[model samples]
Target: GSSGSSGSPGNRENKEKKVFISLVGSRGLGCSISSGPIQKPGIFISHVKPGSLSAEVGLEIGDQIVEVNGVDFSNLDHKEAVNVLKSSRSLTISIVAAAGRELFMTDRSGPSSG
Candidate 1:
């Protein structure tokens, strides 16, 4: 499920693109994943360590876990998502990440009246 606001007032438009990330962890990734309000939630990256492998690969707060090593993730619960994420000792995953936005002073402040 890909999501991004479409140029709404007070909303900055963002471009979403696909990315691939690989992780090698026996214990597990030091972050969390969830599907939010959906039942059999679609796997997603909820958080990751700043300098961790997950982060290094560009995984972000709301990035969706679309696939695992060419395998489709269907009706995945959090536990099931984790299992898939950690399925292999070393594995690669795919994501469709939302483009990040930067808040500028002008975006919030009134137009200059000098």
Candidate 2:
């Protein structure tokens, strides 16, 4: 018998590409996000302001939001993912990285350009 799961995303070893960030703003963190149908359909950074809290921490174009204040976000939709964008002050994330030749491309809107 099969366990309804065939492996693939059954674990997060490869998905463990992580980075830390601390956001603080007298106003707000000031960052925008986008999403894709990766192994987990969660949040990814679409845009970051020049002097915003996100930019201050070096967030780039396509960093994925894997957690919110220690909450696991490996599986969330666009609207659901945005919940982290509001009324919050700090965040830490685990990103999905590029493999093969896809590592150099500027566009990471999808999973692995390779």
Candidate 3:
């Protein structure tokens, strides 16, 4: 009688690769965003103005927005997502390091070209 659920008792440990940002601005965070495709979607920071709130806090373009003000922004549409961000004066955002940006930063370790 083999009638038992086979559940693995192991869980993978994940290193801390996410960054959190807390900022406040009135209808403007001085950064633009682009939404990922509907099939595989996310909210990403597309542009950041220098000397602005975004830049002051080191929020860079290409950082994917995971959550905003403790609410999920990854699954929302472009308009809804924009409105949500626009409406918030203070925000607590969670993001992961940009894959492409990190690649360039780490690539300098390989070779020195003068």
| Candidate of highest lDDT | 3
Task: Kindly report which residue stretches of model 3 are placed more than 4 angstroms away from their true locations once superposed.
Answer: 1-27, 99-114
> Candidates 1 and 2: which is better by lDDT?
2
Worst 10-residue stretch by lDDT in candidate 3?
A: 13-22
**Per-residue lDDT of candidate 1, residues 1-114 (tens digit):** 999886756845344444445554433356556564453346666557777667666667666666666667545667777776667656656665621111111155433531
**lDDT pick, better of 2 and 3:** 3
* Local distance difference test values of all predictions, in order: 0.56, 0.58, 0.63
How much does candidate 3 score in TM-score? 0.60
TM-score of every model versus the real structure: 0.56, 0.56, 0.60
Q: Candidate 2: minimum summed lDDT over ten consecutive residues — where?
A: 97-106
After TM-score superposition, the amount by which residue 73's alpha carbon in candidate 3 deviates from its true location, in angstroms, is: 0.9
Clashing pairs in 1: none
Expressed as tens digits, the lDDT of each residue in 1-114 for candidate 2 is 656766666553754465555545353455666655654466777666887666666666666676765666667666666666453555566665322112224565655532
Looking at model 1, residue 10 earns an lDDT score of 81
Candidate 3 lDDT for residue 98: 62
